[PDB]
Amino acid sequence: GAMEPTMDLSAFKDGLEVIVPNPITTLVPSTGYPRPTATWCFGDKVLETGDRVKMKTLSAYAELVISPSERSDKGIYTLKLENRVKTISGEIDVNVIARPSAPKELKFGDITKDSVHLTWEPPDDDGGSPLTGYVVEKREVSRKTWTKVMDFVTDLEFTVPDLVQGKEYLFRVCARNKCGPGEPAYVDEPVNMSTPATVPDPPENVKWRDRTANSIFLTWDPPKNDGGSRIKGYIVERCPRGSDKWVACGEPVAETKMEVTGLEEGKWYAYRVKALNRQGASKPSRPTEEIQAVDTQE
């Protein structure tokens, strides 16, 4: 008398879902007289015990354990039971998922009195599972606990409300899976609602045209950073060659142009401009070359 090997795979009809690094455990009830021999294969490769691969056989079952699990362990595992009657083979499709990576290119902007707009980009790896959403958290730089602003955000942007003036905030955004949230992405610098205004930046492109014995016409470019306050005007200054004293030309003007006059013929002058706002005056622009006051010739 004898009996064929039989295996019970009814526990894997849906499949096997494993979150890294939890072990992949496949226990299959086996029957058969004589007792069948177990053979484990991952893909077209025969598995044998060693490090992460561990196998055991009892009279009632054959079991395969892969610990710790990796993403590369995903595939179809095959169990062959063999006695003198017959050789049977069954397959188990194992999906090994993990948690998402961190959102990319987290930026902040559009800072109002009570809101901060945040935009990000999808993470590189979703962890072998569809992204369920994004998680938005905040924390004032004085406080030590992160509070969740919103979860399951299905967009690449979010406007954080209910922010208080005079406070600095940190922001981090995570990506979510069925396994849970992943590594967070933080903001490059803290976000400050207050932002006390500063003095402007120097003008940038001071150039000259229409140079005579007593006059010159100067043009410059407005600075990029106004310092948080409106550019009230500009101040043009002058330095003769034989001195290191910068003298102001005329009076403050609201335009990016000025015609300096009163120049003495035969002298060489350099010129520089400052940008004015409520907080004061900027640092002077890069001074121009020393230009001789003389009328055109030939």
Residue numbers in the entry: 0 to 297
What did the publication describing this PDB structure actually write?
To gain an insight into the possible molecular determinants of I110 recognition by anti-titin antibodies, we elucidated the 3D-structure of the isolated I110 domain, the double tandem I110-I111 and the full-length MIR region I109-I110 using X-ray crystallography. The structures showed that the domains contain structure and sequence features typical of Ig and FnIII constituents of titin, and that share high levels of sequence and structural conservation with other domains of titin. I110 is joined to the preceding Ig through a short two-residue linker sequence, residues AM, with the relative orientation of both domains being fixed by two interdomain salt bridges. C-terminally, I110 is joined to the subsequent domain by a flexible three residue long, hydrophilic linker, STA. No direct contacts exist between I110 and I111, so that the linker sequence acts as an effective hinge permitting the free repositioning of both domains. Accordingly, the structures of I110-I111 and I109-I111 show a different mutual arrangement of these domains. Since the crystal structures of MIR domain tandems and isolated I110 show that the structure of I110 is not affected by flanking domains, the apparent reduced binding could be simply due to the specific methodology used. The 3D structure of the titin MIR will help future studies on the pathomechamisms acting in titin-based autoimmunity and should also improve diagnostics for titin antibodies as an important biomarker for thymoma and MG severity diagnosis.
Titin is a giant, elastic, sarcomeric protein with a molecular weight of more than 3800 kD. Titin consists primarily of two types of protein domains: fibronectin type III (FnIII) domains and immunoglobulin (Ig) domains (ca 100 residues in length) that account for over 90% of its mass. Despite the repetitive composition of titin, a single main immunogenic region (MIR) has so far been identified in its chain that elicits the reactivity of almost all known anti-titin antibodies in MG patients. This 30 kD segment, also termed MGT30, consists of a domain triplet of composition Ig-FnIII-FnIII located in the titin segment at the junction of the I- and A-bands (I/A) and corresponding to domains 4 to 6 in this region of the chain, i.e., tandem I109-I111 also termed I/A4-I/A6,.
